[PDB]
Design a protein around this ligand. Structure first.
Ligand code: 60W
Length: 387
């Protein structure tokens, strides 16, 4: 229904991630924590670092419990090593509960904490299967549901501003909402459409068709989910498997062919700029991803605009952007590019993910993001990849 205490509890932007305030320990130590549906550990800075202005001080918490076990995470979007323990954890703009949760106290890191970023830790919201060191380390959300009456569901509304936010603006701006234990109807318009969670590890889904401005990419649907397709609030871009990325970029270039962009732009390395207010949104195509429905032989589509896949960056008074669609060798990743267009419901209790048009998506007077259905789609289980 309505969860006013949790609405507008996030801050951040797609390039730096979105974070929520949490407290750890007794007395409570406040930290800003990245909301990550692409991992399953709760890990916090626990030692001084040049890019952290605060960290978890275990010696100052009366409720700290040492698990006497280390944890190592290899190079991904950095690397880190830490020490496992448990403590009492709360979310100030969250459910009014305190839970005893596992915490990885980060003692050493390399390219993990980012200069200029405001988060001090990560809240991995995915399942125990991908937790480190192994699946015996209960993730935060599993603890929260086990210890309280909070329903086994959360929903995310990530809000892209549509323009660059400077150092002060990004700290003062509302970046979105994380509703723990429910769905807030103020955060979306139209209907919610659900896709099954294929398997509980990452939030894995199945894409059954892809269109660029209504034109079918016409690839074998297994290519779209090779080797998996996931929903990840901790990835900035929409990432596509190599072969799919190559086909999609060719189609996006063809649709936008009235303007030529350098190779560096399509590689996501180089910004493109236009005179203030003159970004030619209309030359760029909409992108639709069709997802398996909950009903046999039924699918639905989510449609995003260039206002989602062109990420605003500062250069001048020009309006500049980076192309936020990129190649992957680990499957499709529906990152902040996708999520900024939609209110996303992680319905763990019913093993499904819901999408609805976000009340904060950026658009223009001529086009809007969309969530539509149903469509008749056959042999959708064949779109899933095995081995
Ligand atoms: C903490 O513990 C564990 N974290 C992980 N993760 C895997 C990483 C990764 O490659 N992705 C795709 C991901 N979704 N999350 C991780 C990170 C995201 C960011 C980050 C930085 C800047 C912007 C954004 C955005 N949007 C995200 C830094 S690390 C953490 N894996 C296993 C663990 F035990």
């Amino acid at each position: 229904g309505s969860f006013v205490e949790m609405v507008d509890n996030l801050r951040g932007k797609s390039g730096q991630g979105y974070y929520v305030e949490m407290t750890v320990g007794s007395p409570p130590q406040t930290l800003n924590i990245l909301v990550d549906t692409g991992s399953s550990n709760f890990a916090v800075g626990a030692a001084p670092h040049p890019f952290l202005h605060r960290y978890y001080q275990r010696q100052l918490s009366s409720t700290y419990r040492d698990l006497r076990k280390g944890v190592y995470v290899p190079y991904t979007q950095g690397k880190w090593e830490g020490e496992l323990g448990t403590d009492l954890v709360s979310i100030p703009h969250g459910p009014n509960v305190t839970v005893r949760a596992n915490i990885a106290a980060i003692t050493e890191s390399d390219k993990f904490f980012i200069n200029g970023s405001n988060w001090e830790g990560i809240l991995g919201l995915a399942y125990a299967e991908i937790a480190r060191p192994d699946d015996s380390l209960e993730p935060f959300f599993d603890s929260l549901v086990k210890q309280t009456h909070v329903p086994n569901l959360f929903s995310l509304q990530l809000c892209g501003a549509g323009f660059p936010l400077n150092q002060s603006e990004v700290l003062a701006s509302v970046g979105g909402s994380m509703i723990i234990g429910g769905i807030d109807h103020s955060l979306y318009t139209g209907s919610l459409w659900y896709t099954p969670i294929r398997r509980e590890w990452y939030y894995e889904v199945i894409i059954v068709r892809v269109e660029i401005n209504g034109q079918d990419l016409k690839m074998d649907c297994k290519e779209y989910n090779y080797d998996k397709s996931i929903v990840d609030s901790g990835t900035t871009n929409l990432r596509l498997p190599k072969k799919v990325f190559e086909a999609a970029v060719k189609s996006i270039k063809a649709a936008s062919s009235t303007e030529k962009f350098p190779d560096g732009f399509w590689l996501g390395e180089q910004l493109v700029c236009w005179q203030a207010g003159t970004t030619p949104w209309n030359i760029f195509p909409v992108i639709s991803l069709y997802l398996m429905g909950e009903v046999t032989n039924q699918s639905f589509r989510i449609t995003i605009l260039p206002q989602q896949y062109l990420r605003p960056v500062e250069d001048s008074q020009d309006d500049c952007y980076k192309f936020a669609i990129s190649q992957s060798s680990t499957g499709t990743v529906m990152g902040a590019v996708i999520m900024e267009g939609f209110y996303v419901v992680f319905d763990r209790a019913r093993k499904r993910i819901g999408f609805a048009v976000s009340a904060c998506h950026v658009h223009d007077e001529f086009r809007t993001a969309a969530v539509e259905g149903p469509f008749v789609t056959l042999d959708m289980e064949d779109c899933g990849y095995n081995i």
